[PDB]
């Protein structure tokens, strides 16, 4: 059954915990992979943790980096992981029928993204600008059988070319080049919402792009003080609810420490720095890191809306915690 | 197919052995988890052993405690366990369609129980009295699609608030607060019987509560000398057969050593100390520990009644043995 | 689909190799169980190797001995084995619907055989003569939904009571006590043949018993010089083809070394020591050990007859090799 | 659903990467098999890596060599491998219903190939010339329910007898002896193409044989300078596209180093040394080794043609990389 993704995003009052690997304690004696850049994606039946490896075990870009996956919450061991693809940069999602994965491998000056569908190579995209072809490093968004992704090529400290793609069963059917001067969109975190795709990216405040299934797009910055224009970096995410926005961020402004969720009822379009709700995901005394979003579709949840969820990488990579939104009572987590 | 649980409990003449992990011998060289608070629950297809971990392996409350599970009798290893939830206290059962799990995580003065259904967060209950929100640590009882649980909040040496809940597909639909002065109901072991729920709890003799699907309840103590009112502690269980009762207990009165089953034909309502049958589960020369009950429904057994079963934790935790009732000839086990 | 077992046994011209574990080399570094008394049994879908353990790993009667199993040819490791039952003596077979297992546990002077069906305890048999209740240590034979087994109780150096049982879905429905003075039937290896059960046992030459589904029985010795009456020991097997017999045996008469199959066209009823075909399974320079038979039913093979197969334990236990009959060209194995 | 294999071979413009085990880094600490002679074959649902073992783990002809398999890309560990057969030489393929495997075991002067179908022994072929019976060491080709293989018996430095077989459900139904003086066909790599079988073998330039389903055959050498007659060795492969040929080879002429694919539009029938496309699979500074082909049928890919793929063994054996053809843009791999 093909995923629809016509349903609006579910409203939430707070976030509750979903999963925690506990890999570092297990790998001190047992056999556990040293993982990097993990992300979570969900199918109609199960949620899984995808990660890039180097082939190294704990307590032991390159041609040897591969993409592997395990059931959410399981230890990423050589005896439980399922191979997906070869890549030093990768993304993945499910279209309701099978897994779609995208993996970039090859030369820095000639990288090729190999598109696989259900384990079979179906298509490839070659580096247009010949400068580190790279992708989302997160879940790709599927609406109506077709999946969408954002890919970049060029410099991480200047202006590089961006393209938005529409993929059907592993094939690229429609692509556009964005006209977005002075914008920087790396490591985009995307989710479906009422048949549209909304993405919040890393400006190396947060830029966003949104688009329809014909790849028509609009852009700007999240206006919230937590300018509607631009004001290094870390991957992150934000959810749009009308004019309100949920912004995930660290607690430190000089280091990647702590993590909190802030609800700003007018932050999408307003520039004020007022907010109503602040919940705590990670204490300021603990290291956090990169974060991103993923969703649980109605086909999986049994609900009439799309449930937003997110993950935080606790820094290679040591652990990956994740949370999902609820409309019931939840407390701050240290 | 939704579990019914209208069928009376099966009569038994004695108990026969079902399972034994043998984890300590295997973990001296291999990779085995250090487990705590195990319990057994059964679905229509399989029985599984649930346990709480700390993430530590053998021969190597907290934010890192998780609930995991393995097929009954298997070694609880990092390579075979299936993640369930995050909790320092937890319970679980199957409604005939999917798994329902309840897991309490967060602050001692602000704990939240996260209710999951088929891996998806569906609801949450927040600490009403702000004092160590805690649950059954056993199998929850499902009658007619809906599952029942007993949860407490307050002091373990005084009077705390109790609530009885009815959960449908992960949602709390009906709850009541018990009016039970001078009663103490911790770590309740519950089973379905003829559409009713019967629970025998820890008074820190044995108190019990029983209730219908509208959460109307009655209570008292097991009268058996093995008072109908009250006379520290350990989790345990007891089965009701009209006025007769099967009581599980240790052999020592000063220590948790040995284990025996005693059948008292008039013990539910009578105060005499006479019994007819005594079987031996654990020798007095061996350590025993916490115990509890679980059931095997007709949908699993092919029978016209519910088969009672129980487990004993052999003390963190080293091993978990279990037995089921039979009406055939069985001998004493040392 | 219930197994029929009406089909005669398949004729063979020689034996070809099926499986070999190679566990000793793998367990010198990895995690492998120390196994004892293995045997092979087949379901309509797969063949599996059953074994008894002590819970010990390599290169590290009792209450701790359990029955476990792995897919045929796989290493018997703690991470791949599936629990079956608790026993210091056990047998198993498949009825076409589920697994039936029989496991004897408890006191030497009060042993109970616990009958399980599809993981559920269904019945028990208690020691009639109170002397080491013990079973076949092989595959049990299923004809027409019902499975048959032979169990003994008493001395291994004198006369003990034997019983033949018919089990349906885990329940004992029909049993008989054999009147067999001066016969000794331990560790019987049984197979179905044209709706009848034929068993060749250990006399501690080879005695046999055969019976129908109403448990009517006949007995005698295999007459072959390789007397029709009696002439310590080892478990073994033999196949009946009219008046001809295939006898498995070691090559040494003073030690358990070597293994060969001998085809004697008139050996079932004749006392001569002439044979036509001798194939070699194990060289005389190698240790062999206990052996037994199992079968592959039409529901598994797609054939119109029952294919005979056998296994040899290479001596606790180090390795288990197995072979199946063919009508094509096969050579001697050293 | 029986595989058809009537569809022509898919045209390609270049090769993209599919899989890479990364076993050497994982086995330095964990439990990984020392593998030899790997090959890849695909079923309608999944692709798998088959290999021969000795039973030895990393960092620890014979009667102990077995054939085992794991999902493509997974580490070949004792805890994930699935047993197939006993052999010091073997081949395998899928007919659309089940797995067909062929395994040669026994004496150098009396070897027998045991044919298994779905785990059951169905037939055997005995050494006609009594000189190291040996097979393809690759995927066997299935067209229309029936599978084809090429087997040899005799000297590796002179003239030996060859036979072509047609196998249906594990049975040999049709075989022919080739009349091919001065030809040498060892370790043949075969693929289906438009209902015909085409094989390119090792001459210890490349000889080929092709045949129909009635086992009528034609032969010659690949004419390309990269003579139509003959001009030690290594296993390899080549794909035929009309008069054009894709030839895989190493970069060194004195050692097994590097790997490249060359497209010669007239190389099947022409003797010129001109080519149009050269892609790089392995750098000349890296060791390569044996290579071979396998295919992905329409039943697996969803396409209207057969997709060619190949593997390279990186030298016992350390790693196995594989690639599939695409018609999209792909770059050279170092
Ligand atoms: C969304 O799609 C489903 C499936 O086609 C349809 O039943 C439903 O009416 C649509 N509308 C929404 C937003 O639920
Ligand atoms: C969804 O896909 C179907 C099948 O291609 C198409 O007919 C339908 O119009 C699509 N809907 C949208 C929103 O594009
Ligand atoms: C119990 O429920 C089943 C299923 O609805 C029904 O067939 C049966 O009559 C009921 N009564 C009992 C106690 O068996
Ligand atoms: C069982 O559930 C069904 C469906 O909700 C309901 O109609 C029925 O009355 C329930 N029976 C009981 C015992 O509540
Ligand atoms: C055996 O049983 C099968 C299934 O009932 C039947 O079709 C067949 O005729 C019987 N006879 C034999 C010996 O094949
Ligand atoms: C086989 O079992 C069926 C069902 O019980 C019975 O009707 C039939 O007569 C049995 N046949 C034999 C050989 O007993
Ligand atoms: C190949 O076989 C399929 C299945 O029988 C058939 O539909 C098709 O027309 C045939 N022709 C080709 C070459 O596609
Ligand atoms: C394919 O097999 C079927 C069934 O045996 C047969 O009828 C058909 O003629 C075969 N086709 C070819 C190409 O041999």
Residue numbers in the entry:
A (entry chain A), B (entry chain B), C (entry chain C), D (entry chain D): 83 to 142, 152 to 295, 300 to 321, 334 to 338, 344 to 427, 438 to 456
The article reads:
NA is an enzyme that binds and cleaves sialosides from glycans on the host cell surface to facilitate the release of nascent viral particles from infected cells, and is also proposed to assist other stages in the virus replication cycle. NA is a homotetrameric, type II integral membrane protein with a short cytoplasmic N-terminal domain. Crystal structures of NA catalytic domains, either proteolytically released from virions or produced recombinantly, have consistently shown that four identical subunits interact non-covalently to form a globular “head” with four-fold symmetry. We use homology-directed protein design to uncover the structural principles underlying these distinct tetrameric conformations and stabilize multiple recombinant NAs in the “closed” state, yielding two near-atomic resolution structures of NA by cryo-EM.
We found that the sNAp-155 mutations clearly assisted stabilization of the closed state but were insufficient for complete closure, as N1-MI15-sNAp-155 adopted a mixture of the open and closed states. Given our hypothesis that E165S favors closure by making space D more ordered, we focused on redesigning the aqueous cavity surrounding D103, which is directly adjacent to residue 165 and another potential source of structural instability, in order to stabilize N1 MI15. Due to the higher yield of N1-MI15-sNAp-174 compared to the other designs and the simplicity of the single additional stabilizing mutation (T131Q), this design was selected for further analyses. Mirroring the results obtained with other sNAps, the stability of N1-MI15-sNAp-174 was relatively insensitive to Ca2+ and the Tm of the sNAp was 14.7 °C higher than N1-MI15-WT in the presence of EDTA. The Tagg was also higher in the presence of either Ca2+ or EDTA, and N1-MI15-sNAp-174 maintained the closed tetrameric state over a period of 15 days. The structure, which strongly resembled the overall structure of N1-CA09-sNAp-155 (backbone RMSD of 0.77 and 0.80 Å over one and all four subunits of the tetramer, respectively), confirmed that N1-MI15-sNAp-174 adopts the closed tetrameric state in solution. The backbone rearrangement in space A observed in the N1-CA09-sNAp-155 structure was also found in N1-MI15-sNAp-174, along with a similar lack of density for the C-terminal regions, the 150-loop, and the 430-loop.
